[PDB]
Amino acid sequence: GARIKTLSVSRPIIYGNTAKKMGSVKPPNAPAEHTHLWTIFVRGPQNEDISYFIKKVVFKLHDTYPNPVRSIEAPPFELTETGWGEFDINIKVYFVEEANEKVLNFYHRLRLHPEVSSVYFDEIVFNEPNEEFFKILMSR
Amino acid sequence: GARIKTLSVSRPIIYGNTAKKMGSVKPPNAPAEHTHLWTIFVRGPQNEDISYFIKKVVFKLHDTYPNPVRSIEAPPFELTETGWGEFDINIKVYFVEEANEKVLNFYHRLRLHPEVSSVYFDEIVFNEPNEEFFKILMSR
Amino acid sequence: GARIKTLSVSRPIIYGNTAKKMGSVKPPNAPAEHTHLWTIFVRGPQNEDISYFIKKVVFKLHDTYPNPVRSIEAPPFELTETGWGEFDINIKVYFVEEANEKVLNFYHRLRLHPEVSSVYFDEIVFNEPNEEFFKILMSR
Prior knowledge:
The structure is a homotrimer of 140-residue chains.
Chain A: E1 2-5, E2 8-21, E3 36-43, E4 54-60, E5 69-72, E6 77-83, E7 88-95, E8 104-109, E9 116-127, H1 131-138
Antiparallel strand pairs in A: 2-3, 2-9, 3-6, 4-5, 4-7, 7-8
Keywords (chains A, B, C): Activator, Chromatin regulator, Coiled coil, Cytoplasm, DNA damage, DNA repair, Nucleus, Transcription, Transcription regulation
Protein name (chains A, B, C): Protein AF-9 homolog
Domain YEATS (chains A, B, C): 3-140
C-alpha cells in the first residue's frame, strides 16, 4: 500500500564530554584549585561536517565561570575548559537560517570522575522541514 | 539491538496550487465570470523528477468544467486553468506498473483568495514494496 | 520542529526458500525417499552484498538431517538440500563483530508443495548502533 504521511528527516548527532585529570602543568590563566581539563562537544559521526545544517552551538556553563554562556559560531562545535566539579550544561543548537527552526535545547551532565568520557549517539528528527532546508539536508 | 520489521520506503512529495487574480485583460476563450488564473500540481522537491515512480497524475475538477477528469500522462504533472470559485480537486496518483499499487487518492481545496498559494510538502510512505519497485525507488 | 530521538538504522533483507520436485534425476548422496530439492537463503535486494554487516548465517534444520546446525560463513548465505517434508527452520543471523549485537533469530517454514517459493522482503532495524558499526552501515 501507499499513504501520505507527515514528512520528517533524521540526522545522527554525537554530543557529550571527555575529561582529564591534570598532571603537573596547568593552562595559563586557569584557577589554581581546578583539578580537571574537559571538553564539551557536538559533532557528526566519523567527525563529518555538521555545519551545513548547524549554524552555531552555545554551551551554558555553571555560573561560577566567567561569561558562562559560551557561543561557538564555527566548527568544531566544542569548548575546552578547566574545572573541579561536575555540573549540568545547557547545549543550545542553532540551525542554519533557512531551516526556520527554534533553538534545539538539551542537557548534559559534565562527567569528570570515573580519561573519562560521557558521550551520546542520538538522532535529530526534523518534523516538517521546508523545501529550502530539505535541499541542504539532502546536500549530503 | 536488532529486530525484524515490515519494510517501508518514503518519498517526499509536493502538491497543491498557486493562484492569481487577473486584471481587466483576461486570456482568450476564458469564461466571463472567471476571475482567477490557477495551477494545480504534484512535483518533487527542487523540481526533481518524480516520473521514475509516478506513471501519471489525474486531476478531477468540479463537474462544471468540461471533461472534468484531466489526465496528465507525462511530467510536469500540473494543469493551468481559469475559475471564479474555490473547490475540491481529487488528485489521483498512478504509480509505475512495477509498484503493483492501487491508485493513491487524495484531495486539495483550490485556494484563490488570501499571488495566493496552498502548497503541502509531505511524504508518500510505501508499505511492503516488492523487490523490483524497491530498485526503482532506490535508483532516484 | 526538531527533537532529539534514539538513533536507529534500517537494512532491507530478503529471506526464505525455493523448492523443486526432483522427478527423475537425483543428486549423488541424497536419501532415496527424498522427493524435493530446496534452497534456504538470506540475501539483499537485487542480490547486493550483505556480508558487510552480516558475518555469518546459521540454518538449523530438522533433526532428521545429519549435522542439522549448518553454518554458512561466506556469501551467498544459502544452503541447498533434498527432502520429502515441510518443517521449521531456525535462521540465525550473526552480525559483524563491530556491531556488538546478539544473534538475530527468525523463523521460516520451509515450503515444498503449492517451482514453489516462500520468500519474505522485510527490514532489520538496528537500535542504538555504535559509531564504528554506523560507519560500516553507511558504506552501502
